[PDB]
Amino acid sequence: QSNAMWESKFVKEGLTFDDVLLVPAKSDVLPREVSVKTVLSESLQLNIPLISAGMDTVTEADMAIAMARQGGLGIIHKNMSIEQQAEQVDKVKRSESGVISDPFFLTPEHQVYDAEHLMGKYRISGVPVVNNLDERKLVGIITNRDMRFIQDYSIKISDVMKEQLITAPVGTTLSEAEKILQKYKIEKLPLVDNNGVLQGLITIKDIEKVIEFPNSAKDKQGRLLVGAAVGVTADAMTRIDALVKASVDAIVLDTAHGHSQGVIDKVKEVRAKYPSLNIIAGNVATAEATKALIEAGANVVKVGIGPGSICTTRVVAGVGVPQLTAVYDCATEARKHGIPVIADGGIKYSGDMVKALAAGAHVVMLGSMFAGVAESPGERQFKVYRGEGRVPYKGPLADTVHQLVGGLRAGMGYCGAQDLEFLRENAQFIRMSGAGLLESHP
Amino acid sequence: QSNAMWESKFVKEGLTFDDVLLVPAKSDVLPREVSVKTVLSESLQLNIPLISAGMDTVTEADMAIAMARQGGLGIIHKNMSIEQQAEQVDKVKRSESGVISDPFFLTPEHQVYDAEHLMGKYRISGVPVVNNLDERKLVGIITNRDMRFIQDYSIKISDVMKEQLITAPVGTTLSEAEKILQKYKIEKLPLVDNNGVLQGLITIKDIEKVIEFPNSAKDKQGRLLVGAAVGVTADAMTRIDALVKASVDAIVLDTAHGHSQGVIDKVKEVRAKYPSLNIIAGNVATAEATKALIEAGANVVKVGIGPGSICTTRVVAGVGVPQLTAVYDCATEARKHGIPVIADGGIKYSGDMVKALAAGAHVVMLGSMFAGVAESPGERQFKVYRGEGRVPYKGPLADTVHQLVGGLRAGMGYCGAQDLEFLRENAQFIRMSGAGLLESHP
Amino acid sequence: QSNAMWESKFVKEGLTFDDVLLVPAKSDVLPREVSVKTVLSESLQLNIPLISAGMDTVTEADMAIAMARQGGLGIIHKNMSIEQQAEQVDKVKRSESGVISDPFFLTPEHQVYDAEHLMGKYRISGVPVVNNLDERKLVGIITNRDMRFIQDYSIKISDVMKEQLITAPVGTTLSEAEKILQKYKIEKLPLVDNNGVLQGLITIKDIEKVIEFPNSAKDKQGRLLVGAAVGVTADAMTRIDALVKASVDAIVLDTAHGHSQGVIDKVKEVRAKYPSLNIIAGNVATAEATKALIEAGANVVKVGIGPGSICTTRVVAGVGVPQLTAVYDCATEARKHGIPVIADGGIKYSGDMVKALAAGAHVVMLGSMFAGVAESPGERQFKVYRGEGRVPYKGPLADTVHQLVGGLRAGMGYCGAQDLEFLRENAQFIRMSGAGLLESHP
Amino acid sequence: QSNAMWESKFVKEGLTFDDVLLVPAKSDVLPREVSVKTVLSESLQLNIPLISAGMDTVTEADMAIAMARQGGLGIIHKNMSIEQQAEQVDKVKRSESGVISDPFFLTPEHQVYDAEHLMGKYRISGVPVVNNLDERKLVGIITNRDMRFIQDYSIKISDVMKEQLITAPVGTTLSEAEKILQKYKIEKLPLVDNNGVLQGLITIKDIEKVIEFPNSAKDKQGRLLVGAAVGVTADAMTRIDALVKASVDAIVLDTAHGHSQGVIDKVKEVRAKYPSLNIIAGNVATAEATKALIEAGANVVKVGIGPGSICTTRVVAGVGVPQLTAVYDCATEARKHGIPVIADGGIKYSGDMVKALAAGAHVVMLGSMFAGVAESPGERQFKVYRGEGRVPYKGPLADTVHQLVGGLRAGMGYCGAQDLEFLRENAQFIRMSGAGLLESHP
Numbered sequence A, B, C, D: 001q002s003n004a005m006w007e008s009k010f011v012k013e014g015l016t017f018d019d020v021l022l023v024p025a026k027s028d029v030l031p032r033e034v035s036v037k038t039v040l041s042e043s044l045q046l047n048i049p050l051i052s053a054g055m056d057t058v059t060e061a062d063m064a065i066a067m068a069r070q071g072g073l074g075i076i077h078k079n080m081s082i083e084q085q086a087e088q089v090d091k092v093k094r095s096e097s098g099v100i101s102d103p104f105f106l107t108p109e110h111q112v113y114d115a116e117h118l119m120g121k122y123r124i125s126g127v128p129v130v131n132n133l134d135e136r137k138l139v140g141i142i143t144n145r146d147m148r149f150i151q152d153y154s155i156k157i158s159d160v161m162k163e164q165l166i167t168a169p170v171g172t173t174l175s176e177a178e179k180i181l182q183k184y185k186i187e188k189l190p191l192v193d194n195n196g197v198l199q200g201l202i203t204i205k206d207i208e209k210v211i212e213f214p215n216s217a218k219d220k221q222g223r224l225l226v227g228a229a230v231g232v233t234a235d236a237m238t239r240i241d242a243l244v245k246a247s248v249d250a251i252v253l254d255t256a257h258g259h260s261q262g263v264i265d266k267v268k269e270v271r272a273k274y275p276s277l278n279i280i281a282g283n284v285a286t287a288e289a290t291k292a293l294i295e296a297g298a299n300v301v302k303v304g305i306g307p308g309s310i311c312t313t314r315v316v317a318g319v320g321v322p323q324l325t326a327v328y329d330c331a332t333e334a335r336k337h338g339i340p341v342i343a344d345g346g347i348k349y350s351g352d353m354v355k356a357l358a359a360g361a362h363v364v365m366l367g368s369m370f371a372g373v374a375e376s377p378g379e380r381q382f383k384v385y386r387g388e389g390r391v392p393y394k395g396p397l398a399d400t401v402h403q404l405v406g407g408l409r410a411g412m413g414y415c416g417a418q419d420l421e422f423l424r425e426n427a428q429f430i431r432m433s434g435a436g437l438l439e440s441h442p
């Protein structure tokens, strides 16, 4: 039928955050008891439904660390050298429990400049010393306590060098090391084989961060999860190869129109080369686009086109979809594949987040709410946000998350939701007019 | 059918006050002749459809007194010691006609400090004196006129002490006492049995407040009605027990989500222990929630979630229902039980109140409109309002009520409503756009 | 069916001026050629569809005169003494051609104070003199030209007194008198019978106002049309009796709720006593109300409740109907009776007027647009408007009318309407959103 | 059926730019590869879908030149003398390649004042000299290089006069002349027949403007396209006759209500006299109006009534149609005739343009966006805009076009549109609320 596309032009209708409210429901569950955890895949498991945007004013290593510590996930932005980005990922992966199975080491023949680089780069504060690279046999350890008395860093590890050291067998756990470090009063516990060949290193920091950040989102090895953004370019594979060597949990293929053919192609290509890699692809606003990314191999779909708070797409190109309808239409399609969606853009308040999750999104992604947080890249106080603009300095990330998560639990309480799955599946909205929205804020 | 909850997510629609207008109708009744009285139960009968909110910036004894005097009802807030709240209720119950059947008394052996406490506490200004507590036989009365000549309050009632006194038999009425007090020129008329044992006390104040506040809402004994708020906590029963000893007319079980299981439980528990007690339960926005509270034993339902003028629920949790739809959906369910609903929150103008009552609510409850009234707890002039904020100092309660009630009678006139029942049942609305609302205010 | 009133409560929907636009149509007729005349009854025929409101800040004699001169109609407001209002009507009726069939006269025995009163009261500037009241035989005429030379007004008409005078037979017309006054160079032309008994008077002013205001709306005798407001009170009949003696064309029974029984009663009563009188009754917003007023005998219906620019009805009582829907629903009912409606309130711009007339109204009524006009009661420049408020000083009425009528002709041009009947009957609207209205103004 | 027009009065609904967004679609085509060209007729072919409005604050010769150079089209406004307007058209037609087939020439007997007039008028900078008008035989050429050494312009061409000159045969092309002018180092290349009779002239400017403005919209002869506005008046034919002599590509019959009979008549009359002329007729908002203009002979239809940014039509006459619905309803009708429509008025941003083109318009017309551009008629910096108002000074036209066209290509990218035909035909919208529009801008 020739005329259908023409006749249907104005037919569709969509809703944004301010058009609706969640409707209260029978609830046996209190806000404090609800579970806010979400699984994006078996290798990607968040304790809070939050991701910081890959954007140069939002997410670099310090941020990805702070996010993961809270149960969420950072995405390292791509506006940096590939070597730089892989390095940013490595810094997040090795922040805690990173040298347990893959330790750095020095030899007596290195300078102390080498020690200070490693401790500085990874924030570890102790370094193992082996006889030689080939042998892998550990002789001595140089640490932060040792650095204090060293005036010149040009001198070799031999000079400022032992005694017997307390070392433990490989596959020693944190709770095991906790007692050893405690019994013997050490802050560093190297791990060797039966031959005394260096295998790994455990520090008290690997211990106390576990205590201090119990909701941390971590891989199986116990290291902080991290994502990274990759464009669709000739550069794409090379960059991914380097990040994968990095061990970063997920790659986000971030483009403006995710329903283009060039993007489907690249997904197909990356899935082929990395069958187990977490591939987050976006951005899409439709069910058809969502279906195409999933059949291309995306294991997560990122959603929204136009809704961003700095996004000029609507005004300049006339293009976009109201975010809740976007999330809803996408989630409707992704649901049939057991595929999670991310809600990307448009979220001003904690209530918006709750609505995004109740319209079907597994996680939400925030740029601007995080832009003035202490841990973000930038330096009353002020900090920049670009895609150009400004937002107040918000203090440490943790305070913003707490109010977000607190809003989420209250909302879950009103809806009677023990967990996010229940919410996505059971929550009902009610549409309201502009005048309906005027009371909502008071 | 597995998919119904998902498909229906965005289906519902709701209206607030500004979306609608009452439509004029055939009217034989003038605003001055209409009846604004409402019955919440046989033991709770208002002459005006207004309740002051249990809130620490709105309602304590002075307020509950002023409300009841106007035909409405105060709810003592729960942000106080239980002993304190029971005492606040007692002050309202004994404001007028309170010692008629349950008198306080002293003995010649008390000090005058005791007299000044009682007169001060209850604003009565005369105190009966009996020989002894066991005997109950009245000897003398100490009053405000007597206090003037007393310099030291440490002295006993014996010293500043009689002559024969004019006393009347129990079950003497106000209109009877009016003539006696008038014939003999006394302001105090104690009541004894045939043995001269003290039974009660009547004062001219019990008389002239009847004259001065003819619309007063009162129990069968003729004392001002009062409510009290109770949370859902381990504290709940103990607090209620004390208030019931107080004789307060109604308890309001006030929680944020009234459709939770913990709230239904507590209602069931209180109804069991107090089969005749007025239990106002809330807050709910749905018919299902309304049904559950009624079957739990609530004899009044309080409505609205999100609409409050300080309420951040909408923004922080994303949760709420547009107030008129809320009231309408609740009233639709409660109607089948012969159960009244209260409209709680969102009312800015007298016209909003009229609309709330025409959408099915029996009474409305107001926090903010009363927050700067003289009788409210706080101290140009200024007074605080929190759930933090401010509202102009409005003068005495009576002036705000008069314009509210005047708006209500005009509205009833336009709709042709002789009484509130007719209004609830017959009144029709018309929906308008935002531009429709722009003319409405001019 | 018991439940219908409850279920239908929120069903109705309504539109105001800003929700819609008139849709352009095939047009063979230019704005200058269209006819803006309207017939409210055979005795009430306007050359422009405009009425000035009976309101103390809008319409008194000066205004009713200015309106009628433009083809419209003034309504003298009722906030004045009945004698005062009848006098205001008489001033409008006698402004031009008023003493042609019912002349005032003096006798030689009156003082000149009497002459100056009459000329001053009615702005006529000549007065006939008869021998005696019984006889009616005219002797001399005293005029403005004569007053100049008179220092003391206490002196009798005898003193400052003749010669033969040029007089004409009764039923002399204006065009006849035009030539006589011209041929003989007189400004005053008395009219007598064959016996020389005074019958009427014609002046050059009666002539030149016809020239100067060709669109004037006039009765059969050629005097300016005038209306008057009457309340529903015990006062009503007495006031009407006096106005009818006045000869005022129409009475407006103006009340807040025209669908009340007391108003239907009064209409029935006035129609009975004055079978030919023009009775404008209001105000109503519904078809049912409209039907009741017509069957009570109203020959015009006035419409709108809430739309007034000073009207607080919406906010205070919650009551009203969006004006276009009001006019449309009323016009739909009145049409079946051949009955015209007036659109009363809400009109900010000339475009609103065009829309009001295209929604079915015969005429529109304006308070606020006329409030600062020179001819209005009040005294940069400033003038008050109450029902309290302010509006810029607009200059003479004629300038405001011209832009109104110019807007009306343009609108009629776009719709292809040769006359108002075509417009009412054929014009189509298109509904738009708030954003649709944002472009409309630029 | 008598009552249909009355019942349907409020039935229609319409949308403007801010009510909607284009929905992203499968896209294989990048913004840089899309084609923005449009054909209004075989003789009217634009490289960009833009027309500058015939308005005295927007388009005169300088503007029509700048527009055409960019691939768009200027319409010379009619608020000028007919001789003046024909002259403005001639200036645009002869800006480049204009004297190739119809050269101006002088004789040795003219003064230099004549030379300076021609070079000044047409910006050509060389003038051919023939022996005599009858003969047409070229003797010498006077140019800009020659003017430098001439102090007095009163002297004849004979004085300041040869040598042999390098001339080429008629039908020489630009690419041919490019090499000649290059090989011989000349900037002027006259064209003669075998007899040495002057036929045309080619300059280096005719060459380098081709290089400098590759997207230029030109006729078959290679001269810049130009339009002109004509009113509907007695003046109409005479004016058109003169413009056609001008060779201007299109005439725009511009009136306020294009659905009037006088406008259909004039179209019929002009089509009869000029069967091949491009006739752009407007303005219309309906399909019925659109059909009537096409059957009258309009080969392009211009659309919108009310949407203009200075247009008071909505407010003053109450008349208009929301622009997208207007364009859509018109395009729906015009499509059946293979007829293009122009979207005229209402466009604030590049996104609005994209939406106008996706609602079915072939081209859009802009007044206000171009009003402060350097090339516009008027003289921080400031420039006026009237239909009275102001708009910032925008710099040269080219910068505004580039952002417009860049917005258009992005939008086309999101929709997957290789060309404008695909866009018109396949693009889908989604309607949003006012709150939906609040996020769109951030």
Ligand SMILES: O=c1[nH]c(=O)c2[nH+]cn([C@@H]3O[C@H](COP(=O)(O)O)[C@@H](O)[C@H]3O)c2[nH]1
Pocket: A053, A054, A256, A283, A307, A308, A309, A310, A311, A312, A313, A344, A345, A346, A347, A348, A365, A366, A367, A368, A369, A386, A387
């Ligand atoms: O097309 C775009 N051009 C941009 O310059 C831009 N900047 C941010 N974004 C998107 O907006 C998201 C952040 O949204 P919020 O600021 O509301 O947190 C981000 O996560 C992005 O998806 C952009 N999209």
Ligand SMILES: O=c1[nH]c(=O)c2[nH+]cn([C@@H]3O[C@H](COP(=O)(O)O)[C@@H](O)[C@H]3O)c2[nH]1
Pocket: B053, B054, B256, B283, B307, B308, B309, B310, B311, B312, B313, B344, B345, B346, B347, B348, B365, B366, B367, B368, B369, B386, B387
């Ligand atoms: O969830 C809530 N958190 C709060 O801090 C709060 N404060 C007031 N209220 C509710 O609002 C009602 C008063 O509404 P108005 O101010 O519009 O009179 C009150 O009667 C309450 O029902 C609250 N609800």
Ligand SMILES: O=c1[nH]c(=O)c2[nH+]cn([C@@H]3O[C@H](COP(=O)(O)O)[C@@H](O)[C@H]3O)c2[nH]1
Pocket: C053, C054, C256, C283, C307, C308, C309, C310, C311, C312, C313, C344, C345, C346, C347, C348, C365, C366, C367, C368, C369, C386, C387
């Ligand atoms: O209920 C009312 N109380 C008032 O104090 C009042 N003042 C004006 N009006 C009505 O408004 C009309 C004038 O409307 P505009 O100001 O918009 O011209 C008038 O013609 C009246 O119908 C009132 N209605």
Ligand SMILES: O=c1[nH]c(=O)c2[nH+]cn([C@@H]3O[C@H](COP(=O)(O)O)[C@@H](O)[C@H]3O)c2[nH]1
Pocket: D053, D054, D256, D283, D307, D308, D309, D310, D311, D312, D313, D344, D345, D346, D347, D348, D365, D366, D367, D368, D369, D386, D387
């Ligand atoms: O009825 C009208 N009276 C006017 O004074 C007027 N001025 C501009 N226009 C129209 O508006 C168009 C320009 O629209 P924009 O300013 O939004 O670019 C123009 O192209 C015109 O179609 C007018 N229409």
